[PDB]
Swiss-Prot record:
Homodimer. The chain holds residues 869 to 1008 of 2193 of the full protein. Cysteine protease that cleaves viral polyprotein and specific host proteins. It is responsible for the autocatalytic cleavage between the P1 and P2 regions, which is the first cleavage occurring in the polyprotein. Also cleaves the host translation initiation factor EIF4G1, in order to shut down the capped cellular mRNA translation. Inhibits the host nucleus-cytoplasm protein and RNA trafficking by cleaving host members of the nuclear pores. Counteracts stress granule formation probably by antagonizing its assembly or promoting its dissassembly. It catalyses: Selective cleavage of Tyr-|-Gly bond in the picornavirus polyprotein. Disulfide bonds: none annotated. The active site is at H15 (for protease 2a activity), D33 (for protease 2a activity), C104 (for protease 2a activity). Zn(2+) 1 binds at C50, C52, C110, H112. This is Protease 2A.
Length: 140
């Protein structure tokens, strides 16, 4: 689990969005596994705008922050499960790191701020959904 709280906005994995997220929907994309919803109180995170390929991500299934190198946002895919079983993936950055399905929502952070949240992974790969192209998150 996990969210980015940026202004009065909440960024979550689309597949973990709550009824309240859908009922207070700002924006969603199944091909990014991203969903953004409204908050009443302002949030304590800031968003990176950058092309950093180094950062640190939170891995709930090790209670550890790991420093990683990660790919630039691209089109990628997977192999059978049960909620989305395999799937492709627009704007998936990959790194070598331990990630299980429930590791989704952990933040990836570089020197410019929040980069993304854990979205996919497998066989010692962790995939992050980029939020760095989403400039509209900072204003309005
Ligand atoms: C962060 C993260 C997200 C998804 C993921 O795998 C779970 C899943 O989607 N499956 C598809 C591939 O086959 C295994 C089951 C993993 C390993 C990590
Ligand atoms: Zn950066």
């Amino acid at each position: 689990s996990g969210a980015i709280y940026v202004g009065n906005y909440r960024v979550v994995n689309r597949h973990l969005a709550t009824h309240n997220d859908w009922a207070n929907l700002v924006w969603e994309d199944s091909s990014r596994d991203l969903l953004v919803s409204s908050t009443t109180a302002q949030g304590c995170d800031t968003i990176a705008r950058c092309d950093c390929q180094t950062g640190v991500y939170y891995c709930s299934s090790r209670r550890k922050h790991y420093p990683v190198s990660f790919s630039k946002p691209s089109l990628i895919f997977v192999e059978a499960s049960e909620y989305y079983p395999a799937r492709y993936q627009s704007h998936l950055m990959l790194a070598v790191g331990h990630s299980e399905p429930g590791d989704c929502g952990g933040i990836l952070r570089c020197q410019h701020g929040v980069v993304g949240i854990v979205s996919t992974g497998g066989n010692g790969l962790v995939g992050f959904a980029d939020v760095r192209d989403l400039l509209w998150l900072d204003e309005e």
